[PDB]
Design a protein around this ligand. Structure first.
Ligand SMILES: COC(=O)[C@H](Cc1cccc(C(=N)N)c1)NC(=O)CNS(=O)(=O)c1ccc(C)cc1
Ligand SMILES: [Ca+2]
Length: 223
């Protein structure tokens, strides 16, 4: 997260770290057994880490639970990043408490202009590289279709939305991928892609979670 702030320990209790010997992506706990992340974060050997603040120190509120299976969206297109969503099932149920909690799926899509919370342990620099050990947070608005479409030379689909500031300085970044965008109290986005981080006229692109609720519910009903 570039241009954000230290969240405070366990203030974002649905935020998870995905660990394959090291932190590589974020995710969101949606119930005691399932995490939503980005399809581009797929890999084998995932351990889900719940209740984290400092990812490099055991502070006492963590739950480390291995993934049993990962399910990439059936239409995920790595060429275009269309349908950049993945479900991760836990080998055992998380113990839900004040510091480890689920975030609900949306009933309706969030509206342009809504302020959202984006969080993660990703790079904090627009130029260069600095990784924080504690969880970082950013509040930023959903952009119009017009601004989002015109914001990249690359292909933009109806399953993506933009959040941030066209003037630059505030954005998600490398290592934030897969993590949550919470708007109107529900999980509305997944950190998906961007051109660099926090650059002028180059906002973040996010998976539009409200388009996937049927697939998520059907999938978790049978796995
Ligand atoms: C990988 O390095 C980076 O610093 C950012 C990471 C990133 C990840 C998620 C969200 C954001 C964000 N700013 N909201 C940033 N990604 C890139 O900079 C990748 N862009 S890119 O322009 O380098 C690029 C473009 C197209 C292809 C096929 C591959 C790579
Ligand atoms: Ca820790």
């Amino acid at each position: 997260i570039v241009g954000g702030y230290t969240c405070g320990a366990n203030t974002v209790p649905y935020q998870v770290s995905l660990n394959s010997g090291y932190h590589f992506c974020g995710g969101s706990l949606i119930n005691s057994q399932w995490v939503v992340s980005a399809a581009h974060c797929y890999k084998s050997g995932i351990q889900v880490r719940l209740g984290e603040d400092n990812i490099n120190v055991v502070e006492g509120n963590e739950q480390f639970i291995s993934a049993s299976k990962s399910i990439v969206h059936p239409s995920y297109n790595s060429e275009t990043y269309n349908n950049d969503i993945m479900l991760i099932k836990l080998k055992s149920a998380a113990s839900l408490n004040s510091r480890v909690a689920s975030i609900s799926l949306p009933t309706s899509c969030a509206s342009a202009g809504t302020q959202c919370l984006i969080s993660g342990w990703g790079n904090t620099k627009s130029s260069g590289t600095s990784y924080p050990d504690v969880l970082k947070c950013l509040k930023a608005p959903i952009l119009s279709d017009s601004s989002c479409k015109s914001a990249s030379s690359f292909i933009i689909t109806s399953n993506m939305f933009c959040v941030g500031y066209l003037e630059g300085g505030k954005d998600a970044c490398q290592g934030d991928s897969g993590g949550p965008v919470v708007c109107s109290g529900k999980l509305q986005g997944i950190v998906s892609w961007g051109e660099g981080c926090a650059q002028k006229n180059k906002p973040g692109f996010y998976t539009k979670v409200c388009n996937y609720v049927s697939w998520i519910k059907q999938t978790i009903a049978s796995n």
